[PDB]
Amino acid sequence: SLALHKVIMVGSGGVGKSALTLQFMYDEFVEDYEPTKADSYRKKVVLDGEEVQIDILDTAGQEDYAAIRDNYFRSGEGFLCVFSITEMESFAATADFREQILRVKEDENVPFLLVGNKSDLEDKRQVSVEEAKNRAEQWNVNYVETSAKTRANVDKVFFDLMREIRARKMEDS
Amino acid sequence: NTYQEFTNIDQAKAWGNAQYKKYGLSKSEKEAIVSYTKSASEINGKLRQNKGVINGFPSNLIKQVELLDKSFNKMKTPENIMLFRGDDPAYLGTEFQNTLLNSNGTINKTAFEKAKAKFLNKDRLEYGYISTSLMNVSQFAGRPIITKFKVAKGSKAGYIDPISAFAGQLEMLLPRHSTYHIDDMRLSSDGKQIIITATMMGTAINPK
Numbered sequence: 001s002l003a004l005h006k007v008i009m010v011g012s013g014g015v016g017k018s019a020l021t022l023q024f025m026y027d028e029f030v031e032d033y034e035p036t037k038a039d040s041y042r043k044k045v046v047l048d049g050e051e052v053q054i055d056i057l058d059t060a061g062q063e064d065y066a067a068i069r070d071n072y073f074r075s076g077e078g079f080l081c082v083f084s085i086t087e088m089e090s091f092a093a094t095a096d097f098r099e100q101i102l103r104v105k106e107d108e109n110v111p112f113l114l115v116g117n118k119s120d121l122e123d124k125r126q127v128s129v130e131e132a133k134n135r136a137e138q139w140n141v142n143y144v145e146t147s148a149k150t151r152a153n154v155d156k157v158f159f160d161l162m163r164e165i166r167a168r169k170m171e172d173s
Numbered sequence: 174n175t176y177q178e179f180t181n182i183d184q185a186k187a188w189g190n191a192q193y194k195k196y197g198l199s200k201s202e203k204e205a206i207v208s209y210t211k212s213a214s215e216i217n218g219k220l221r222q223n224k225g226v227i228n229g230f231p232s233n234l235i236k237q238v239e240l241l242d243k244s245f246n247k248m249k250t251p252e253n254i255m256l257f258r259g260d261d262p263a264y265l266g267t268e269f270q271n272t273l274l275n276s277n278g279t280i281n282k283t284a285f286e287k288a289k290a291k292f293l294n295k296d297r298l299e300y301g302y303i304s305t306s307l308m309n310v311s312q313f314a315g316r317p318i319i320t321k322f323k324v325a326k327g328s329k330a331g332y333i334d335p336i337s338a339f340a341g342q343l344e345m346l347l348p349r350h351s352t353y354h355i356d357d358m359r360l361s362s363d364g365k366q367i368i369i370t371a372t373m374m375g376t377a378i379n380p381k
């Protein structure tokens with residue numbers, strides 16, 4: 001009888017979906033983790049005084065066709081739309097994930113977070129804070145820059161996404 | 174004169190967006206600012222550390238300070254406004270660090286009186302940039318000291334929320350090396366918070 005917040009990691013390949021999951025889970029910066037490797041994780045964390053359990057699906061994505069993708073998009077409760085601040089292509093792609101996620105869940109207000117990862121690579125930034133923050137405002141969601149390397153804001157994105165999921169569960173029931 | 178104090182978050186945001194859109198900040202000034210918001214603590218700390226002298230700053234930081242300073246030539250408040258921010262006991266002095274508070278969490282009567290004796294009715298020079306907000310947000314509330322800054326029309330002040338790492342909300346930035354007069358210092362009904370009302374006088378850094 002414990003709350004379970006199912007989080008799904010989305011974003012182009014090589015943006016840091018795995019590193020972020022692993023940094024949050026085992027507090028380590030795992031580099032170049034198998035690109036095509038997918039895995040779900042489930043740990044217990046205390047969210048604002050209350051103890052809950054979080055489930056994180058670290059998607060590979062290279063071959064998750066319509067039926068596979070639709071199933072977990074539909075099952076997932078919260079989404080972390082991750083991209084790399086040093087790769088403009090991954091940022092542009094975030095609109096595709098958003099779109100597909102809202103199409104299957106037939107909802108324009110699902111728990112969602114725009115995450116610009118690799119904030120430690122400021123010298124290679126290709127996406128401006130202004131641009132990303134603006135998009136987040138358009139989608140009516142928060143934008144957070146993280147660094148799976150320095151661990152900056154990693155806990156924040158996962159706990160903030162939960163808070164959004166936990167609140168959406170209140171509106172319903 | 175009259176001072177515009179925001180009470181509706183949407184009105185505040187709309188207003189801020191209205192000014193920001195007019196700044197016409199270069200890419201470098203925006204970047205300089207985003208960088209300030211990512212490490213305000215280090216930058217302002219280093220500015221206090223040297224009482225404001227920057228000729229000892231590495232090229233990267235000294236370059237950023239210059240951009241920061243001059244960006245204010247583009248950011249002025251069109252009217253009288255009230256800016257808010259919170260601080261800890263160290264703000265009043267090292268000798269307040271572990272003295273300001275009582276064990277029950279309220280401001281200590283004697284500590285407060287010494288605070289007034291030390292600051293009330295006196296100008297104060299801040300070596301670092303002053304980050305504030307257009308409204309009394311939650312980013313504070315749980316802080317021992319609250320300051321209401323009265324910024325007059327035409328003063329250097331810029332809404333930088335569109336490019337900050339959500340350091341609270343409704344981020345407002347004031348120039349470094351500014352002086353202000355503390356007109357009032359009182360306690361809240363709570364008794365666990367000092368409310369400081371001040372008049373912003375301006376900065377000594379006016380390049381260009």
Ligand SMILES: Nc1nc2c(ncn2[C@@H]2O[C@H](COP(=O)(O)OP(=O)(O)O)[C@@H](O)[C@H]2O)c(=O)[nH]1
Pocket residue numbers: 011012013014015016017018019020030031032033034035117118119120121146147148149150
């Ligand atoms: N500098 C830096 N590199 C990162 C960061 N996060 C991931 N990386 C690197 O970016 C590459 C892709 O990361 P990965 O976690 O595999 O991304 P995924 O494809 O979204 O799962 C790997 O070489 C990582 O070591 C970060 O925060 N900073």
Ligand SMILES: [Mg+2]
Pocket residue numbers: 017018019033034035036037059060
């Ligand atoms: Mg991966």
